[PDB]
Design a protein around this nucleic acid. Structure first.
Lengths: 213, 209
DNA sequence: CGGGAGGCCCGCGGGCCGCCGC
DNA sequence: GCGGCGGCCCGCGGGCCTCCCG
């Protein structure tokens, strides 16, 4: 330190930044909706949201909530640019990844692999954040989860996992995997996972119990 | 589906963002520097930076980069308020928590337990956001990591690990843990971990381009 | 017995590498 | 023989719940 303690001198407010985030959020909400995955590959990093309109019994309510419009996402995710560990040198030119697009395609493949969900019942929205604006990517994703409370982000976790891998097989298969088998790596997880009965009830409770702030 | 497909209808641009992120970053830059951990506990969520002024041979450069001022952090982190996956299972009673302060303290403890790093050679800065502002925390952290590329966030990974736990006993120990034993839990990781020579050249590379 | 810090689980998804498709 | 994408590792730290202080 070398200097006295005082909480107040460390508080940061910027209401302007709060408006800026609201703006990115409302821009997200009105971007075009596509099939999962979108008809074309593209470059960029950003945020995306997945919507359900099918009739799988635990999720049937989405067919009504999302009947006339894409109102409530089941999942919101992100893909942050390859911006890594850095030392901006050579390290030659080779520019422009397709991180957002790949992740969207990846999540498509996981749903394809399940028995009980059909990919044709999913749709998506996404927003590309470029350059310096890419710093905002994980805060837009958090802002969207806070407004929508997507089921797969806040109740039935696990959709977001890539393969835990060999160094991690002792872990329990996630609630998403237990009600939507089978990504095959999920069958190599040896830990104690939750029982379908208790996940089913949580999903029901999601819909029946009011979530309005 | 919709009807078209047009990449630029999905691209967000707002140049005023550059000014706001600049402002947040200079505010962070000018907040009071304290020991690690700070001398008092405090409530709030936020972002923090760790600075080194010591003489451990690999890191010796910092004692010059940080000689006259706290310029280049060695680590940047963040602590978010309780439940950012839409909060716990509660009613209306206790909206105040200490997750930033706790988190900074944990990092101190981990440094205390190493053999080759002295806590006295460490300082920190931290910024609190509250409570409408918390969505802002990650974007400031990310800006800071991008601008300073702290060595423990970019080259010598793993200081931010919590205990992997009994589900992940077969994973490798982290580069940080290999050059800075010992958190007792890294000792219980049985995977093949990086060589110290490899890490040490990455460190040297960090301080000559 | 009560509140909060910390211990100890895993969600999410970054990055790298090998493999396949060219 | 090359580039891009998926497969397979673990980084970072969230969140629950324990237990540790009161």
């Amino acid at each position: 330190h070398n200097k006295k303690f005082d909480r107040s001198e460390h508080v940061y407010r910027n209401d302007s930044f709060l408006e800026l985030i609201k703006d990115a959020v409302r821009f997200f909400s009105g971007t075009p909706v596509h099939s999962l995955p979108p008809p074309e590959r593209f470059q960029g990093a950003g945020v995306y949201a997945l919507y359900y309109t099918g009739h799988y019994s635990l999720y049937d309510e989405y067919s009504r909530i999302n009947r006339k419009a894409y109102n409530l996402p089941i999942y919101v995710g992100k893909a942050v640019p390859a911006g890594w560990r850095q030392s901006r040198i050579s390290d030659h030119e080779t520019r422009a990844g397709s991180e957002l697009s790949n992740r969207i395609r990846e999540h498509g493949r996981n749903i394809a692999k399940t028995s009980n969900l059909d990919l044709c019942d999913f749709s998506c929205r996404f927003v590309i954040f470029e350059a310096t604006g890419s710093d905002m990517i994980s805060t837009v994703q958090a802002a969207l989860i806070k407004i929508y409370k997507p089921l797969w982000n806040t109740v039935v976790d696990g959709f977001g996992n890539h393969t835990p891998g060999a160094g991690r097989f002792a872990q329990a298969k996630s609630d998403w995997d237990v009600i939507h088998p089978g990504r095959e790596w999920a069958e190599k997880c040896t830990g104690v996972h939750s029982e379908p009965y208790f996940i089913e009830e949580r999903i029901k409770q999601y819909f029946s119990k009011s979530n309005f702030t």
